[PDB]
Symmetry: D2
Subunit: 385 residues, 4 copies
């Protein structure tokens, strides 16, 4: 279960780099230099790194000091072979984005938001990123009249159509992935789930430029089944990126290392990613618990990739097992793939077997055998098979 | 706060008609005849009624006894002036729909599902319904391998495209509203929120025939802000119907009378429905708590409409108040309506005031005054103003 | 991983005998004869069965029909060597209970409830039950003024006090175990968590005759840590019995088979009970899904036992592992067991190294080494180690 | 609805003094001088302020700087007639606490925590505090093996026992009030609910020196009924103090102003405390949103007091209403107060009307009349009545 760069595992600079501050405490670890992070990650067997502009270049740096940062970073990438698949904007930390970035009530703060973003898009594309994520963590409200949602969305649609026009005019090959989240730090964040984000993308001027970047713990802060949501992102053809971590319940977002939190949901997400051939980076946006020192950080981080590869093995052994292939026919998972009525309406209506002569009760009593199948999955996760 | 038929309040036959059975208990009230329900509701001041085929016509009734039911019902409507704005199918109760209706693994049960639905669509349109709701309460799973979600959705899309073709061929003016729900009775239901349902409708053959039918308690079983979701259904132009009730938390769906459960969320939903000019029925899909006898039922039911009209008054007094109109300018809710960059990209990029010369910190310190505004809403809800 | 009576695995008649009617669903299974259930669970390796009074004797039986159901049950237990370690009363199915048993507002319903419980305490004793469970499913409320809850804690205590007087006047060697649950079938239930039941006991006249019977799913309904809840109850000496099952987070109570739901909490639970030296029943309170026929009912009751036995084996190996031992030392679980200040408050107060010359910066710099310890735990659970 | 000291409304220095840094956000406000806060809260009508040791005296101060901060604070309290009813210790901000204070695995951190608490018990006593709050925010865990929780309940009890010995050896007229919280800043926190804190107290050497300090938001984090939780604590005689605020369901702790969040639970809370005759502080533990400047900080601290006073007035009128009295009788809240069986177990057992000749069908047919009683309650709250 040794990670190699062929596995496409990537991490955020801010993940291993998180210093330990939370609503009730101060930093527990030092600030990590992005060069030591690149180097360490490459020795852990990771494939790449990602970044918010303010992880790389500390807010309000001039162009000198901006260059000095990018250059020492670009040397650490060249030397390691590490790649930067995705980058993003910090439109949440500075006191100025307290009521948002793209949907801030103040018109000045909103146009700025966008200048800060376009500036970083040019660094991302230079460094090789093919996805540009946008997590609108400040777009929402703690009270009902503070934000009119129909207009704030007109604004959000305008801010994305503005970005879609600029990439189109510059000829970049970059695509945007919108990252939904139900709450935290705002009381309610706009586009709270993968569903909302999928529907919102269909109202942007050029929908094809836009997908989602789901995050495990996010959808589970809404008590939702993450593999189910990802299957709908896949069905739409909109899983551009995926953020992986752990969450132990409906509570504040924990950002545990992946495989921690809900373990059976972690197994079905690996199973689905792998059975549907997801190509993108397996990115860990997670937070080494502030109880740890730096050794615990790279450890927590190695554990993210270990559990991915272990669950990957158990999901392939499950799908491969003849007895489970048989168990799927027993539960009629082959009949689900069958068209309900390729032939059509006229045919269905006419069919007496489908209503008039249909023995409902015989059919009611055909057991689904779902439990035999789920214990086979349980033994395969546990390696009792 | 006297309900009149001009207020468009409507109820389900199964709401006041619910006998009191739950996962741990038996019926506490008798079965209510749909004629006594029509009559009683009209005397309460309601505008109309709705129905699942099996509320009206008891499952497997022949055509004689089917006619006998519809006719005595149609006489109670004629005599009262009561209207039937919406109807639907019970694709959840009978033991045969234990693994779904439209996405049942068994192909036979699926085509049947549809015959049962098309049959009822013809009764609905005859009776004057303009919306046909579909609540797929059995479409989901309690375990990961029991349902492949990408295929079950291909099936769900096919089942809806099949219905969209039949209305198109018969020339009916009926539209479909899809009702999302996170869970219960299935462990995870497909299309768990308004967001998911909006995005799914964009992949049906004729999207224009389809909207949502949100339900208050549903989105709050996902810990989500219901007014926020409804604003996105409105923005899309997809709020075809709305189901109103109460929910006191993330737990089993309670179906409390409306205004019960989350009261501040009830005030912002009325405020939004009214400020955006929703035309549809104000439908109460709720359940008189089984502690009640029949007097408690019509009482609980009258309380649904009372709280709608009381909250309606407080929302109009809030929007009307000069001091609150002033409070909205103070929080810059007028600037949210303003285009971010009608002029465009070139202009924004060039603008030094929007990035290069922008004083972030002055702007950071412009307080939002959100709290003064939310206490003004609080005094208006409470009638301290 | 095949069970035998040595494992003390038990199952209520109500669990495999669930007919599958839920809020929106008719029963999908035929009732099971009790005598068939003790046979089939004996053949799968069970220790014995438990029951509610109205599980074994139909409500209303008459008092020769009762005689008969008891003789048949007795003979089947004697035939298989199946025990009856626990029994309980049903104070939630019949409508006389719609407002509660011990705390209904109607006095005469609290008298019919108290007398009904004493009838089954006598029978339970004759059959060999040494624990009597009390789950007040209907005690609680939907609205605020409906229940004065300080006077309801008065009526709860009165009942449990008279029940204690009753069994001590009889010389009955039996103890009570109160089962908490936060909600369902009531909006909120009285004594909603483990901590709430434990606190109530201390105010009873004979605190020693009472303990707690916690369920996995009930504490998970409130997002609590079920292993921690079990540890506080063993710390208090009050874990008299337990109900094992699974639950996928905060929603309706599903009662999935033990092992399903939060699989790592089931790992951590079995590590606790086996380490604890808990020697009461491993009782399963689960429902086979209504998707399942009677074969699938037996694949799910066997799944319960199998999951617990894999889990015991994985937890046993985790704790025996040299690696894990060194990591526990590294995370100072041994320092946690040394007293903070056995040297009294006076030498603590004069210990200048406890404050004045405590170095908080060398103490704050130390990593806890919990991510590495938890990854060794994940490795054992997945059979990677 | 203007407050005055007669209303005993208090506020920690940490509440209006929150600078607004959250998980993803830098502080949006300047720190407040303590002396400015007692002045501004005195001018709004407060009773007094509370503090954590490191709120009044900066961590690391030196032991003349400490002298000075105490003298300045004293003089400002004496200037305004502001009291200091409660004080607490900060065992959660500094990294030495990252694994806990009283239950860190490191022994020497449990010694620095115990000594730090005793330093502030002395100071609190001199200033007039008759309640000492203990919120173990960092006591608990993120992973299972990290904390043996039965040995952590040993270390918790040891600390609270030595603290009891300390204050009785001193003759200090002060009592402790343990504050539960389910999670944040730890994945799960020890003593997570009211019931869990109440149960722990009974095992201490001097149960009488300890009570509970529950917060609205903390019980709501677990979806519990906060009015019911407060009623069990007054039933046990243990409500020593309270923290009032608001929370919109299950998610991170927001600490909204009292009145916001679950407005009807705030109604039902104030009905309980005013009916209860609770005469301790009405303490607000809230955060003005980080959206707000310092004027908006004061519009939110004034909102707290105003909401409680409207609510007291609406609840007072609900209970005084003839209509409500008759409805309470109709829902037999008076029968709930008559003993079930004051006539002992023996005449209960021979009362043939308690069982043999109890008619369960005429008892089951009776409505509880709770929807009508709850709608009269909704009418009072909205000022419709
Ligand atoms: O009545 C016994 C109780 O254990 C059980 O059936 C349950 O857990 N209800 O939720
Ligand atoms: O430490 C005192 C405690 O009351 C407070 O600040 C809190 O409620 N934390 O959640
Ligand atoms: O700002 C980038 C974003 O992905 C971030 O890591 C997040 O989702 N925190 O909740
Ligand atoms: O089947 C119609 C549907 O609207 C139903 O009332 C529901 O949503 N129960 O959860
Ligand atoms: Mg995140
Ligand atoms: Mg993310
Ligand atoms: Mg519903
Ligand atoms: Mg509905
Ligand atoms: Mg149970
Ligand atoms: Mg249960
Ligand atoms: Mg507090
Ligand atoms: Mg708090």
């Amino acid at each position: 279960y040794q990670p190699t760069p062929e596995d496409r595992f990537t991490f955020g600079l801010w993940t291993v780099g998180w210093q330990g501050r939370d609503p009730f405490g101060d930093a527990t670890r030092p600030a990590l230099d992005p060069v030591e992070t690149v180097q360490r990650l490459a020795e852990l067997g990771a494939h790449g790194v990602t970044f918010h502009d303010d992880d790389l270049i500390p807010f309000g740096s001039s162009d000198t000091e901006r260059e000095s940062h990018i250059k020492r970073f670009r040397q650490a990438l060249d030397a390691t072979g590490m790649t930067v698949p995705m980058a993003t904007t910090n439109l949440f930390t500075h006191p100025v984005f307290k009521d948002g970035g793209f949907t801030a009530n103040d018109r000045d703060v909103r146009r700025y938001a966008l200048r800060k973003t376009i500036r970083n898009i040019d660094l991302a594309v230079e460094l090789g990123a093919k996805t540009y994520v946008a997590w609108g963590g400040r777009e929402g409200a703690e009270s009902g009249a503070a934000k009119d949602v129909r207009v704030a969305l007109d604004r959000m649609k305008e801010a994305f159509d503005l970005l879609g026009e600029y990439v189109t005019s510059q000829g970049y090959d970059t695509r945007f992935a919108i990252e939904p989240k139900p709450n935290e730090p705002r009381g309610d964040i706009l586009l709270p789930t993968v569903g909302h984000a999928l529907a919102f993308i269909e109202r942007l001027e050029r929908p094809e430029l836009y997908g989602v970047n789901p995050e495990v713990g996010h959808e589970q802060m809404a008590g939702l089944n993450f593999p189910h949501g990802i299957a709908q992102a896949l069905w739409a053809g909109k899983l551009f990126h995926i953020d992986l971590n752990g969450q132990s319940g409906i509570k504040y977002d924990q950002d545990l290392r992946f495989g921690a939190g809900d373990l059976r949901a972690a197994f079905w997400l690996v199973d689905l990613l792998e059975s549907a051939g997801y190509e993108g980076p397996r990115h860990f946006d997670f937070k080494p618990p502030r109880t740890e020192d730096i050794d615990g950080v790279w450890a927590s981080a190695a554990g993210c990739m270990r559990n991915y590869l272990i669950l990957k093995e158990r999901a392939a052994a499950f799908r491969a097992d003849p007895e489970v292939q048989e168990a799927l026919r027993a539960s009629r998972l082959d009949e689900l793939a069958q068209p309900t009525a390729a032939d059509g309406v006229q045919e269905l209506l006419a069919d007496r077997t489908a209503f008039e002569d249909f023995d409902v009760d015989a059919a009611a009593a055909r057991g689904m055998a779902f439990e035999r199948l789920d214990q086979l999955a349980m033994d395969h996760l546990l390696g009792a098979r």
